[PDB]
């Protein structure tokens, strides 16, 4: 699909058997989701920008589906204000910027 | 052009006659640049980030060139981790996401 930027590029995703709404973010190196439970081991990490930094848990090799497109990659879980799908997963679905 | 996301989508912009490196951020509603001098009056604005809200300066109707494409719009100035071209200007240059 071709997504306009007149509005925030919000799409539906399926992760951990759950359906959530997330922002396709090209400025994000990583994928960050609001508090939730995920399988496997994790390690602490800090991500920051406008407003400062927040602490999150890093889970690797997590299965996720963005708009029907299945992808695998690292997912960070923490007190983010909005679900974010970063470049690490955007590439897996073949997403690109065009103008 | 078509821009993949394997690495940060950094491009060259021109503002106030100076060239700068900026990040194409679809996760950003607005365009935020590092501290710099801009003409005219400015108004206050609150922007939300990964770590919370902060106050930045808002300059309206500012000329700026992104990847050779000319645009004229709102530019916010504040302590951003990197220069960011948000949706407000990404739309002016006809940018969309595709996969
Ligand atoms: O928070 S920002 O400064 C911002 C800028 C302009 C307008 C609004 C905001 Cl919130 N920012 C840019 C940034 C930060 C740090 C390094 C490089 C760029 C956002 C915008 N998109 C990527 C960034 N994030 C995702 C995001 C957070 C909150 C709301 C929308 C999107 S993030 O979490 O800070 C993040 C930083 C580092 C690694 C992964 C992630 Cl995912
Ligand atoms: Cl990854
Ligand atoms: Cl590719
Ligand atoms: Cl604008």
Q: Which two tokens stand for residue B89?
A: 């200007």
Cβ contact A91:A85 at 8 Å: no
Nearest to A71 by CA among A11, A19, A14: A14
Tell me, in Å, the resolution of the deposited structure: 2.3
Range of the domain at A61: 1-99
Report the gap between the CA of B90 and the closest CA in chain A (Å).
Answer: 7
Cα B35 from chain centroid (whole Å): 13
From the list B5, B27, B51, which residue is nearest A96 (CB)? B5
Tokens of A43: 């390690």
What's the number of domains chain A is made of? 1
Does residue A89 line the site of ligand 1, with CB under 6 A?
Answer: no
Obtained via which technique? Answer: X-ray
CATH number at residue A33: 2.40.70.10
CA separation for the pair A54, A77 (Å, rounded): 10
Q: Are B32 and B56 in contact (CB under 8 A)?
A: yes
**H or E segment to which residue B91 belongs:** helix B87-92
Task: For residue B88, give every residue at least 6 positions away whose Cβ sits within 8 Å of its Cβ, in sequence order, or none.
Answer: B29, B30, B31, B73, B74
User: How would you class B63 by CB atoms within 10 Å of its CB: exposed for 0-12, middle for 13-18, buried for 19 or more?
Assistant: middle
> Which two three-digit tokens encode residue A51?
């407003």
CB-CB contact of A50 with B34 (8 Å): no
CA nearest neighbour of A26 among A77, A98, A80: A98
Residue in B with minimal Cα distance to A27: B25
Helix (H, G, I), strand (E, B), or coil: what is residue B85? strand
Which residue intervals of A39-94 are DSSP H helices? 87-90
Alpha carbon of B64 to ligand 2 centroid (Å): 34
Q: Which of B28, B33, B24, B29 is nearest to B1 (CA)?
A: B24
Active-site residue B29, yes or no? no
Strand B18-24, strand B10-15: pairing: antiparallel
Does any ligand 1 atom lie closer than 6 A to the CB of residue B79? no
User: Phi/psi of residue B33, each to 5°?
Assistant: -115, 155
Q: Nearest CA of chain A to the CA of B44: how many Å?
A: 16
By CB neighbour count within 10 A (0-12 exposed, 13-18 middle, 19+ buried), where does B57 fall?
A: middle
**Are B31 and B78 within 8 A, CB to CB?**
no
């Amino acid at each position: 699909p071709q997504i306009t930027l007149w509005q925030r590029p919000l799409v539906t995703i399926k992760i951990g058997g759950q359906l959530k709404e997330a922002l396709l973010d090209t400025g994000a190196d990583d994928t960050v989701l609001e508090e939730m439970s995920l399988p496997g081991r994790w390690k602490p990490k800090m991500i920051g920008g406008i407003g400062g930094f927040i602490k999150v848990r890093q889970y690797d090799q997590i299965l996720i589906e963005i708009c029907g497109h299945k992808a695998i990659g690292t997912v960070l879980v923490g007190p983010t204000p909005v679900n974010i799908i970063g470049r690490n997963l955007l590439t897996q679905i073949g997403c690109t910027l065009n103008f």
